[PDB]
């Protein structure tokens, strides 16, 4: 009666252990999943099986899965690159999602907190770069200073806005500020490559190697920009845009960013985004040429950074392991999982059983066989 339950739970533990030690099964499983903007479901299924990397052993095995899955994904899913940027690369976003945990979060704050705080603090931060906006603020400032409605029109074109010396002066000043502010963020990021979690740098290393192997004709530049999509755009950008939501800063129990603070961070994030991909501001905005020159120069720094980030030790060397006989100091590996999660996992393995274990004599087939029927919410 009761022994039935136990034995099955132990049987599951055994199966889960096989899943952890042989990345092939779960790598294949992930491949057999729908391209969703969210990885919420597969994240809980996968991460749970590794206890969210609670120890070095699990951490090692998890990265092995990421490596295996990413390699597979690039090889049989990425047709002409750019899809990594444009699409929803399952593995890439899983890696980023995993790095939203304690480790990754701690790393981001060490890298960004100082500069984000600076921006948060500076009450008098003017990095406004739109001539029309500067014009409007000007007219309104006079209006409230004087107390009379200005004779100047509220609606004006950029060229006619720049017609005023005061506008051009404020713009020149604002431009210099945007550059200084953006330079502080760039520097803080470029000089903190070592603060980025190994798991993140390692995957960038894997990504670059896999891409170079599928697209030999792809230039070292086009590949580094792809790595930047992972390192800067996907990993850091969201946190600069929403520092509180990403635990970069700790606001009062009931505090939130001011619209000024959000706007400012939004603009800086935009600057960095352009720099990381060597993307110039276009349109009829010649007043921004100073900014574009800064972006081209900045890209050089970002490029070397993306390169350095990939210069990381192989998995074996990093975790100081020669055989697997290592890491296993946890004695009896236990995977902490609920009945609900067991049912989800069991159901998936059964739906893709032949896809995850193509060999008819694969050991997992027997394990799943004797494990039998998927349990009920209460068995």
From Swiss-Prot:
GO terms for molecular function: actin filament binding; cadherin binding; calcium ion binding; calmodulin binding; GTPase activator activity; GTPase inhibitor activity; MAP-kinase scaffold activity; molecular adaptor activity. Expressed in the placenta, lung, and kidney. A lower level expression is seen in the heart, liver, skeletal muscle and pancreas. It is found in: Cell membrane; Nucleus; Cytoplasm; Cytoplasm, Cell cortex. GO terms for biological process: caveola assembly; cell migration; cellular response to calcium ion; cellular response to epidermal growth factor stimulus; cellular response to platelet-derived growth factor stimulus; epidermal growth factor receptor signaling pathway; fibroblast growth factor receptor signaling pathway; fibroblast migration. Residues 2-314 are annotated as: C1. Residues 60-309 form the Ras-GAP domain. One of its GO terms (cellular component) is cytoplasm. Keywords: Acetylation, Calmodulin-binding, Cell membrane, Cytoplasm, Host-virus interaction, Membrane, Nucleus, Phosphoprotein, Repeat. Its main location: membrane. It comes from the Eukaryota. The keyword Phosphoprotein applies. Interacts with CDC42; the interaction is demonstrated with IQGAP1 in GTP-bound and in nucleotide-free state. Interacts with RAC1. Does not interact with RHOA. Interacts with TSG101. Interacts with PAK6. Interacts with TMEM14B; this interaction increases IQGAP1 phosphorylation and induces its nuclear translocation. Interacts with SASH1. Interacts with PJVK. Interacts with SLC26A4; this interaction enhances the chloride-bicarbonate exchange activity of SLC26A4. Interacts with SVEP1. Interacts with ILK; the interaction is required for localization of IQGAP to the cell cortex. Plays a crucial role in regulating the dynamics and assembly of the actin cytoskeleton. Recruited to the cell cortex by interaction with ILK which allows it to cooperate with its effector DIAPH1 to locally stabilize microtubules and allow stable insertion of caveolae into the plasma membrane. Binds to activated CDC42 but does not stimulate its GTPase activity. Associates with calmodulin. May promote neurite outgrowth. May play a possible role in cell cycle regulation by contributing to cell cycle progression after DNA replication arrest. This is Ras GTPase-activating-like protein IQGAP1. The lineage of its organism: Eukaryota, Metazoa, Chordata, Craniata, Vertebrata. The gene is IQGAP1. The chain holds residues 962 to 1339 of 1657 of the full protein.
């Amino acid at each position: 009666a009761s022994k039935e339950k136990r034995e099955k739970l132990e049987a599951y533990q055994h199966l889960f252990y096989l899943l952890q030690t042989n990345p092939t099964y779960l790598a294949k499983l992930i491949f057999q999943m729908p391209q969703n903007k969210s990885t919420k479901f597969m994240d809980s299924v996968i991460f749970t099986l590794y206890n969210y990397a609670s120890n070095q052993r699990e951490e090692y095995l998890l990265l092995r899965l990421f490596k295996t899955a990413l390699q597979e994904e690039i090889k049989s899913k990425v047709d002409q690159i750019q899809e990594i940027v444009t699409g929803n690369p399952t593995v890439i976003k899983m890696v980023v999602s995993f790095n939203r945990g304690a480790r990754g979060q701690n790393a981001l704050r060490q890298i960004l907190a100082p500069v984000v705080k600076e921006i948060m603090d500076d009450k008098s931060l003017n990095i406004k770069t739109d001539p029309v906006d500067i014009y409007k603020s000007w007219v309104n400032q006079m209006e409230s200073q004087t107390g009379e409605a200005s004779k100047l029109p509220y609606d004006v074109t950029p060229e006619q806005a720049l017609a005023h010396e005061e506008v051009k002066t404020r713009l020149d000043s604002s431009i210099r500020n945007m550059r200084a502010v953006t330079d502080k963020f760039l520097s803080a990021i470029v000089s903190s490559v070592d603060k980025i979690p190994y798991g993140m740098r390692f995957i960038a290393k894997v990504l670059k190697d896999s891409l170079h192997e599928k697209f030999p004709d792809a230039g070292e530049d086009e590949l580094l920009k792809i790595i930047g999509n992972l390192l800067y755009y996907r990993y850091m950008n969201p946190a600069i845009v929403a520092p509180d939501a990403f635990d970069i800063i700790d606001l009062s129990a009931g505090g939130q960013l001011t619209t000024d603070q959000r706007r400012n961070l939004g603009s800086i994030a935009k600057m960095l985004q352009h720099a990381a991909s060597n993307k110039m501001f276009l349109g009829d905005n010649a007043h921004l040429s100073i900014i574009n020159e800064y972006l081209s120069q900045s890209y050089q720094k970002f490029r070397r950074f993306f390169q350095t980030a990939c210069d990381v030790p192989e998995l074996q060397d990093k975790f100081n392991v020669d055989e697997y006989s290592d890491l296993v100091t946890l004695t009896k590996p236990v995977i902490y999982i609920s009945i609900g999660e067991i049912i989800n996992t069991h159901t998936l393995l059964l739906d893709h059983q032949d896809a995850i274990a193509p060999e008819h004599n694969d050991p997992i087939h027997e394990l799943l066989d004797d494990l039998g029927e998927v349990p009920t919410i209460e068995s």
